[PDB]
Amino acid sequence: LSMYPIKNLEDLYDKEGYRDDQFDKNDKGTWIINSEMVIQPNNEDMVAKGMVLYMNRNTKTTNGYYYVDVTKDEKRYPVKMVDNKIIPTKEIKDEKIKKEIENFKFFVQYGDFSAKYQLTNDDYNVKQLRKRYDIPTSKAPKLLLKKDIEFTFVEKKEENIYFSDSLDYKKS
């Protein structure tokens, strides 16, 4: 987690990950960057919000989608990513969706550092998440590093608040 933060996404275009015999030799590979806030308050609806981008190093173009996901006990919005900036490709009528996208940063852009940790609200990353999101709890989440970063706030089987962040590298 030394690299965190990568404030400019375009940097990623020039960083290579794990490749194998299966990997094409033509292919520079693709980055699959996903950040997701999940918030499930007690025995009501869960709403999960995030975004997925796809950074094809060959074309050096990036599209993906902002997803909103309510689920009892999924709407995607198509974005592209030019010049370290996420922009919507299908029209959005909603204003609150048009804005979260505009003010959206991936955790790798702002985050600053299996594995098992109990954090304080003095921690930097917990403060980053609280400021940026509307988190319905006061307690200091755990950190779960399996790349997969998770901050889990509340796990009770009747309510579940958590944040996950991944960066992955695949063939295109």
Ligand SMILES: [Ca+2]
């Ligand atoms: Ca930390």
